[PDB]
Structure formats: structure tokens, C-alpha cells
Design a protein around this ligand. Sequence first.
Ligand SMILES: [K+]
Ligand SMILES: [K+]
Ligand SMILES: [K+]
Ligand SMILES: [K+]
Ligand SMILES: [K+]
Ligand SMILES: [K+]
Ligand SMILES: [K+]
Ligand SMILES: [K+]
Ligand SMILES: [K+]
Ligand SMILES: [K+]
Ligand SMILES: [K+]
Ligand SMILES: [K+]
Ligand SMILES: [K+]
Ligand SMILES: [K+]
Ligand SMILES: [K+]
Ligand SMILES: [Mg+2]
Ligand SMILES: [Mg+2]
Ligand SMILES: [Mg+2]
Ligand SMILES: [Mg+2]
Ligand SMILES: [Mg+2]
Ligand SMILES: [Mg+2]
Ligand SMILES: [Mg+2]
Ligand SMILES: [Mg+2]
Ligand SMILES: [Mg+2]
Ligand SMILES: [Mg+2]
Ligand SMILES: [Mg+2]
Ligand SMILES: [Mg+2]
Lengths: 87, 134, 80, 200, 81
Amino acid sequence: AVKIRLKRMGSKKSPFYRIVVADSRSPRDGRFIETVGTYNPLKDPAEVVLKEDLVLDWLSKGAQPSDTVRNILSKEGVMKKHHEAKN
Amino acid sequence: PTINQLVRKPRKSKVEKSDSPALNKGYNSFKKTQTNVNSPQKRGVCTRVGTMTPKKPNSALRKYARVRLSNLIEVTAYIPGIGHNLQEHSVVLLRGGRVKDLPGVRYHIVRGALDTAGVNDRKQSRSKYGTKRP
Amino acid sequence: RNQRKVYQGRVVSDKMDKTITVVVETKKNHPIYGKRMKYSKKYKAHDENNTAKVGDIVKIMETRPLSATKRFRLLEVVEE
Amino acid sequence: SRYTGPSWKVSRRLGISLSGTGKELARRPYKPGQHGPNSRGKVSEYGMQLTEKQKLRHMYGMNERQFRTLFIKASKIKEGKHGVNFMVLLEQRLDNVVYRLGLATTRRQARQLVNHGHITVDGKRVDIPSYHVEVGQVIGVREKSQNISTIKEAVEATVGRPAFVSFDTEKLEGSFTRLPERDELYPEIDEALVVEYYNQ
Amino acid sequence: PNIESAIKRVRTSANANAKNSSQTNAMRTAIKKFEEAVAAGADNVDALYNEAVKAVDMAATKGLIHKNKANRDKIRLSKLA
RNA sequence: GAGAGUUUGAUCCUGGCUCAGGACGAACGCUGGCGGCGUGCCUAAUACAUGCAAGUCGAACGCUUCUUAAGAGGAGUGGCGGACGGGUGAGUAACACGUGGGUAACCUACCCAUCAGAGGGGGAUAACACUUGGAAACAGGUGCUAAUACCGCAUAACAGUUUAUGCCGCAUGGCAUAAGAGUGAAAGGCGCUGGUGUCGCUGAUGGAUGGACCCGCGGUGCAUUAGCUAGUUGGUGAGGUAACGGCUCACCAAGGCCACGAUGCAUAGCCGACCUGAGAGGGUGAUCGGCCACACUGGGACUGAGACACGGCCCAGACUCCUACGGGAGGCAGCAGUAGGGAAUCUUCGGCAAUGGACGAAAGUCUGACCGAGCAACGCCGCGUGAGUGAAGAAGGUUUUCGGAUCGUAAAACUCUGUUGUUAGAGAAGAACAAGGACGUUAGUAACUGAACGUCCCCUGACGGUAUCUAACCAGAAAGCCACGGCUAACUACGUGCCAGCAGCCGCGGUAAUACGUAGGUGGCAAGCGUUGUCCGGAUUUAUUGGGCGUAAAGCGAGCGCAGGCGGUUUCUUAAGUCUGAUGUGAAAGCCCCCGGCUCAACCGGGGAGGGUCAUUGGAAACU
Ligand SMILES: [K+]
Ligand SMILES: [K+]
Ligand SMILES: [K+]
Ligand SMILES: [K+]
Ligand SMILES: [K+]
Ligand SMILES: [K+]
Ligand SMILES: [K+]
Ligand SMILES: [K+]
Ligand SMILES: [K+]
Ligand SMILES: [K+]
Ligand SMILES: [K+]
Ligand SMILES: [K+]
Ligand SMILES: [K+]
Ligand SMILES: [K+]
Ligand SMILES: [K+]
Ligand SMILES: [Mg+2]
Ligand SMILES: [Mg+2]
Ligand SMILES: [Mg+2]
Ligand SMILES: [Mg+2]
Ligand SMILES: [Mg+2]
Ligand SMILES: [Mg+2]
Ligand SMILES: [Mg+2]
Ligand SMILES: [Mg+2]
Ligand SMILES: [Mg+2]
Ligand SMILES: [Mg+2]
Ligand SMILES: [Mg+2]
Ligand SMILES: [Mg+2]
């Protein structure tokens, strides 16, 4: 299925992540449909940059966030917006 | 040439050839064919060890060895330095490089590699001739 | 609605029934020397009633494969 | 790596005083070696260019590889003369910044201070002598290290601060007010020859 | 096989193949009876027609033949009838 | 967009050779302190010991063994996964790939949303119980046994198809409405109170994703490879496919490709990219990303939404292994590792803590993907191997014109520092979670639990006591390599005597060698240095940009000539080329520009730009 998940980048022991829309079958760092945000856990308040409109459109289209992306979208309130849209 | 002539028969640059061809071809025992592999050095066995006479300007007894390489090609290689321990059936390593004096010698036998002992008493440019720092 | 590629050409073979061979006759610059060269590409187009003859200027629109080589449909006979 | 051999010998080979005192050249101002005292033949154009390049890199105590990379950075700079920009970057090097402020008598001494961490930038330890110091940054001695005879003697002895530096003795803190100018740098060194050398 | 799951799939695929081939042959026999009856001009042609269509649809179900395959077969049978 | 050396007694020209620059998945030789990041079978797609690399679900089902009726096990059946992820590039000169389009000729499990259904029965069979054969592998026999396993019947046509209308396109035709004829399904589990939440089940539709096919254009050598083709080219039917189609078959014709290079041969995965270059170009296709093909060799199909399936099946073949000799078993181009080949490439390591993936309601299980650690100076970057003072200049080396000169402020001596090193203490971020427990809001209910959403409590680190921080002790443990005749920065003494030997090119050595060996000095670079190998440059040395042919290499001995190339002036017209506006695209990462983050740098991250002889559409008509 279509997944919204973290593609790891950066260097050894210095992780960074791009929140990207990708098919669940594709490799973690390989083919992906589209990038939607970034996520740097090394900052005390994990820094997140997000394309909320793109995320909401994909969620409506049926994209399934991973667990960490679900936490990220909850903290950004995107999950609440999607919930309201479903209602 | 006219532009139309060039279209009909385009330019073709000369083909360049290595100065040490024996190092550019490997061997495959299974298929018993030669491969195209670029190697910095190649191992061989001394089929004959002796001396050679230089070209006209020079006169000496230049020490050489006829070596069959790992790819089954026989070549002639020079033995740099003063004195050596090489006999026939000795396993040696060959590097590229011509010897201007000798007619058909294109390779040097690396000193300090495999059976080739370094040059005794060498103290300057020791990395060449393969002698340990004393 | 999406458009299918259409080509203008000259018929060069009609001995085959229900079909024709068309030629495009373009010119392209030689990649190295830049001289304009006569480039000829020919397609096998489907004629419903063998209306077109040899040496006729016609138009053909690409279609689903109609045979082993056919990929085009005859549209008009611009000249005879 | 870091050169550690004699300093006078390097300076007299270059024919100019790296320390700026002229002390090395004062006695025996020949090139080093047994062939020094006797005259030597004239040098070729390649030799002249090499000598100027060596002057710069030995002045700032750098290795050739890092020196070449720094030269390319100066090239990437758009405005002003390429050689002048290159020398300006050489000054902005942290070792020379400390030396200009006068916390050390010699660039070797300044380099050792920086490497051992006695120097701080804006209150933050920086052990990299190669560190690029920008205009306005505050270079200061580590609090623990401020009470060391070495830097104490160096500061009190150093009298002349270049116009482009501003220094405070009590705090042992200095900073570049502006970039050095061509004249403020060493005028003996011809940067054009070095530019041509690396232009090859 | 070297994997327990691989061995299990061998058994299940064998059983499924037996069942699928049996049912597919049943559908083919139904169509075969209808076509022979059509050629002979028999009297139960309509009954055999309905049974052939019924068999084709039941084969489409259970995933013996693709839906397009079933639709083409039904069109073929209708033109024959 | 730099040149230099070398033909000669000297010169100009022509011309080759060689060098100065840069690059590496490099190897070798001498040497070697540390850290960050990255890279590491290029050869034999050679053969592989051993270990692991794909399982999961008890909330689908029935059994079976133990723990004081529990939970923990065991194998069944059944569902999903196994077609992903990982590896290699052998094959392939081809719609394989790149780019730009087309499909009104297509399919799509899981995921989202919508509309419907979810009724009734039936017969089995593993497991199990015995029982035959055997070392086991495993093969059977009989007798039962359940299901979300299987099969019928019932209803469902919104699916498809046919007709009639209406609208529309690009020829076939597309969409909408109505009718009509034939037929098609399912399964229950968990939990609340016959009703019901939720996970499942069946039909149809749309979306998303993935896949399939067709087409324009582009990227190898050879003519000492010129003809090739016979389901071949087309048509008519039939069958087949998800789908169009010689995809297949029967008939009908004789067509089709080819100097715009077919065919054959040789070589080759293609690309983003990477090295080089002023650019045009030349070379490469490692690492990373996309696509493709392959899974011991060859062939075939089964299951499935999806394979003609790396760790599945059948057959054949080559090879290997275990046997009680009866009979069995296997495929590292998965991670390590072994042997072999080679100049040459690593540990048979820790963990699922993070990201991702399979199953499951979930805890959670699995995950040699992936995170880490290990080994190699293999590469790039960073820091050291001490700092200040220190003599008309100690001794010792070297050399002296015996005065001295040089190694040399170098050392010694004095005064400092601890990056590093050792010793001790302190010590992370990476962790977000999920589950679980509290509550609260929306939609639904008759009501609940529950669904979704929101705030709290709690929970978890292999790396690892790692990075990092603090304090104390010691200049103490930490510098080699090449070169010094010209090119080319660097010179003397001995030894040697065309010998030994050196040499990239020119060229040195024949008893006074700055060219050989050593020593002393000096130059270049530095934990590296040098040699070899390969690629681009210089090389205008294949000259499109950008060369030539009287004597340097180069005009066919001459003509006649098909094809092709080129073509006098001018009116109108067309728009193939040509030029141009707008628009779509040229993925991400990478180069380059800006801005941040790592003590700096490498490196990492953010934002741009560029990149096409790209494609659609709209224009102009000077030139061809
Ligand atoms: K199973
Ligand atoms: K000469
Ligand atoms: K020349
Ligand atoms: K499956
Ligand atoms: K294409
Ligand atoms: K046909
Ligand atoms: K290949
Ligand atoms: K194969
Ligand atoms: K498998
Ligand atoms: K995990
Ligand atoms: K396991
Ligand atoms: K020389
Ligand atoms: K030209
Ligand atoms: K003539
Ligand atoms: K035009
Ligand atoms: Mg955090
Ligand atoms: Mg370094
Ligand atoms: Mg390989
Ligand atoms: Mg190949
Ligand atoms: Mg069922
Ligand atoms: Mg050029
Ligand atoms: Mg395997
Ligand atoms: Mg320390
Ligand atoms: Mg010189
Ligand atoms: Mg010498
Ligand atoms: Mg060229
Ligand atoms: Mg001539």
C-alpha cells in the first residue's frame, strides 16, 4: 500500500529523515512517490518541516502513515485535521 | 576534406597501444583464453637468467631474466640494482618500464617482491630496490 | 482528450491490400558536422478501401497495433 | 603534519625574515648549506614563482595541500585581486589572528596555544588552528589559561597592533575590526607570482 | 524445499491445482457438450446453452478464469446460440 | 584555451616521441601517530565446509503434552506473506535503456471512499487412533474429527453483452438513460447489551499504487560482412490473451527489410551520473538512485492479485554429498567465511534501540534489510610528532685555499604547554514510540462497550560507559619518502674506472662523474612518499569548433558516367528545415549558487539554478 514514512539520510551516527510518500514494497532509501517533509530527531524539540496540504491529500487518498510519522503528524495536528475532514 | 566527405566517412582517430602490453591481458584457465585486464604488475617465473649487451653508445653486462608471466606470455625483464639472487624457476613480480639500452626489454623485476631480494647495502632511494631501512 | 501523433507523408507501396507504406522525408543536422541530411522514415498505415495509390501525399494518425507492423490509420489523400 | 625544524634556516632560504625581526638574516644572510656563503647562479622564472609561494606558506606554517585548497577558495571569491584575497584569508586563519593580537610572540607559539585549546572564540573552545576567523568574532584566552607566563609576557611585550585589529589587555580579548589591507600585509611578498604559480 | 513454509505451499498448491483442473475441465465439458449439441441441432440446445453459461460464470467465480475471459466466452456462446 | 625537451655544424619548416596538470574501487616498494567521513573480488556468472539471510497468526479450526483449572509447549489444517527486501551482470545491439508521448486494446492483493449483500444446507479430510514398509528421510491402510478449509441450492447484474434513444470523439468508437435475454457470492471470530461495536466475508464502482502493451527520437566496431526474410509482409476467418496484434491456426495473395547500412560477425547491461577538457568533445557506467536481465545449465508449467518464482515444484543435464547400500539430498551472483584464480581487495562480529518490511487486534515473533562495531593509510578532511629564550656559533659529521665554512639556535641550558599519550573521576543526544492506565470531544447507538480524535501517567539503547566533559603527570611514547646534469626547485667530497651501474626524453660511466655507489649538505611533499598500470589534457597528433596534399605524408594515369552532394535570376504559394511566445516534463541524490549544522574541514542538511539538438500548442516567412 501507499505509505508515508521516514527515509533516512545524513551520515553515520548523525541521522536525518525525509518524510516521503512511498509504496510499502519499495526500498527504504530507494524509489519513493514524493517528499512531503523533514524530521531531525537530534534536536531536543524534534524539528519538523511539513507540507500539510500534501499530507492531507495523500491521507484522503488512503496513504497509511508509519508509527513515527503518525506521532509526527499528531504533534503537527495534521491527524486532527484529517479526522475532521473524515467527519 | 569537404563536409559531405566527412559525413560519408567520418574522422577516425589512431588507436594507441600500451608500452607494456603484457600487463594488459589476463588469462582464464577454464576457457583457456586471454582476458583484457589492466594490471599494475604481474607475477611470473624466470625461465632463464643471464646478461645482455647494451646498444652502441653503452657497453656493460646488463642483467636480465626471461620470465613467463601468470598469463602464459613470455617476456624479457631487467633486474635493477647491484647483485641479485634470481635463478630459473624463481617467482618474480614484473612492473612496466623500458630499458633504453636493451633491444627488446620492456619490464623491470620489482626488487623486494616475492623471490626477488632487495639490493644489499643500498642506502639511498631504498624504496626503489626494496631494501628495509637499516 | 489526448491526441495521437499524426504524420504527413507520401505513399510508396500499395500492392498490399487494405494497407499502404508512407514516407515522412524529414531532414536532420548531422550530429558531428551539422550538415543537413535527408532522413527518411516510413510507416505502414491501414487503408480501409485501398483508396490511396503510390506517390500520393496523405496523412496518417497513430492507432493501436493493427498487424505485425501496422501502427497507423489513413486519414486523407492530400495529393495524387 | 607540522614543520618543527629550524626557523632561521627556513627564513634565510626564503631570503626574507619570517619573524619580521630580521634576526635570522642579521648573521649569515645566505641560503642554508655549505653552498650558502659562496655566490649562486641566477634563478629561473619557475624558481622565482616557487620561492614566493614558499614564502607565503612558510609565513603561515601551512602544508601544501591545505595551502592549495585555501588558494582555490580565494579564487572562488569574486571581488578584488585574487592574490590579495588569498593573503586576506591567510590572515583570517585562527593562528595568525592570535599572533596579530599578540598573545604569542611567534606563529609557532600561537599555533601551539590554539592546538592546546588555550584560545576561545566568542567564549567557545576552538582547537583548530586552521579555523577561519571572520570579522567581529571575539578571540579570547581560556579563563584557566589566562594566568600563564607565556601569554602574559607575549601580551606585555607586543606593542604594535595592526590597524585592523582591536585588542583589550585585561580581558586578553581581541577581534578584527576590518579586513587587512594590501600594505598592512607583508609588502615584500609578491602575491602575483604566487597566483601565477598556482595558475600553472 | 529448505523452508517449512515452502513445503506447506507445495502441498496446498498441489491440492489447489487438483481442484482447479477438475473444475476447469468441468466447465470445458459443459461448453463442449453445448457446442456438439449446436452442431447436431439437438432439442435441449437451450438447456445446454444455459448450463454452459452457468458453468462459465461458476468458473469465473472461484478464480479459475479471469472476468474478461468469462465475458468473452459468454459472448462466444451467445453468438453460437 | 600558457608550454618545455629532442632531428642540425648552425637555421626555418614539417613531424613523431617525451615531460610539466589532473584522476583512481588501484597494486607494489620504503615508511607509518591519531581522529571524522567514505570506500574495499575490478580476475573465476569458478566450486563452495560451517553458521544465519522468511516467517507469522490460538481473536480461523480441532486436537495433543505439561504447571495447581491455569498458563506454558507440541505438532495439524487454514489465512497472509514468501513475486518485497538482499545479490550479481552472465546474457541482451533489443522499445533493454534514456527521453517525449499514446492505450476509445489493458490488469491491479494489501490501502482509502461509495453503493449493496452477508440465506440456507451438505459431504469431506488432515490432525488423531491404531497398522504395513524403512536408518531416517519418509511412503502407505483402515476408522474417526473442525473450521474463516471445500461443494450444491437460494437471492443479488450495479458486471458484461444486445437493442432504442440522447450526447460526443480519433477510424475502430466513447459516455449517459431505458429496456430486455442468460447466469453469477459469501464466513465467521472477538466484545458489549433479539439489538449491537469492531476485525473479517461477498458483488459493483471510483481513487491511489503497482504492473502491461504500442510509438517518435537518441546513444558501439567491422563492407577484408550486401543482400536478408517464407507465419516471412498483408488480408479473410477461427482460437487464444488482462489486453491489441501472425500471438496461434486454416485459407487468400507475394509481399516485407536493405548503402538513411538490412543481414552476419565482434563487443556491451542502459541511465542519473563520475574523471578530464576553455569548449566542442574524449573516457568510464565502482560506490549511491532508477530501470532492465539473471538465480548451477536447459526446458515446462502449478499456486497466486502478482512468478513462468535466488533461498518453490516437475523433467533433463553437469557436478557434489549422506547412506545401514535398501534408499536419500543439494545449489552462497543473501551476510560472514573457505578453497581456487589474481598484483589486488574485510569479521565465520552485536542488536532489532532507531528507519523500513511480513504476520497479528495487540503485546509481540521474524527481519545478515538496516543500524552499529571489527579489519585495510584504500581515499578525502582535521590535529600532532612540541613552544619561547638560547653562542661571533659547544663537541661530533662533512668540507677546507687549513684561515675557515657548514650542519646551526640546530643541540645543550633555562622557562613553558598537554592537542595528543597515560591515569583517574563525570557522561550523553540518537527515544519517536507502540502496548498499558487515566480521562475528554466528535460520528453512531435505545443503550452501551467500542471506532476516530485530543491531553496526561508509564514504558524501552546494540552502539556503550561510546562520543563528550573535568582534573593530575610527563617533552616525555609519535618522520619518513623521493629528488638535486637540462627539461625542473635542489651541490660538494670521496669510491668507481664504458666495469659496477643509472635513465620519463635528451643522455651519463673509458682514472679528476654536481647524471653511477656512498657520505655531507640542499629541494619537494609529508603520515605519507615514490614506482608501475589505466583515462583526459597538453595533442590543431583525425583539425565540426580547429589541419592539410608542387618539393616534407598525401591529387586516382586519364576519361564516360548511375546513385548521391551541390546548384543561375525572379512572382506567388507551402511550411520540411530555420527562428520565436506560452505551457508540460527533463525524479531524488550528485556538480554549481545561496543559507544553516557538526569546535574547523571533510561530511551532513535546507532553498535555488542548470541540464533536451525533449514534447504540445500559437506565431514569422528573409534563407534552404
Ligand atoms: K502456514
Ligand atoms: K639528440
Ligand atoms: K616538437
Ligand atoms: K503470496
Ligand atoms: K521509448
Ligand atoms: K489475421
Ligand atoms: K551485461
Ligand atoms: K538462465
Ligand atoms: K523464495
Ligand atoms: K526494527
Ligand atoms: K530465524
Ligand atoms: K636528473
Ligand atoms: K576542418
Ligand atoms: K594528374
Ligand atoms: K518552416
Ligand atoms: Mg529528542
Ligand atoms: Mg593530511
Ligand atoms: Mg565481479
Ligand atoms: Mg558481458
Ligand atoms: Mg472459504
Ligand atoms: Mg583541447
Ligand atoms: Mg542461495
Ligand atoms: Mg586530552
Ligand atoms: Mg635548477
Ligand atoms: Mg649520484
Ligand atoms: Mg584532440
Ligand atoms: Mg612526397
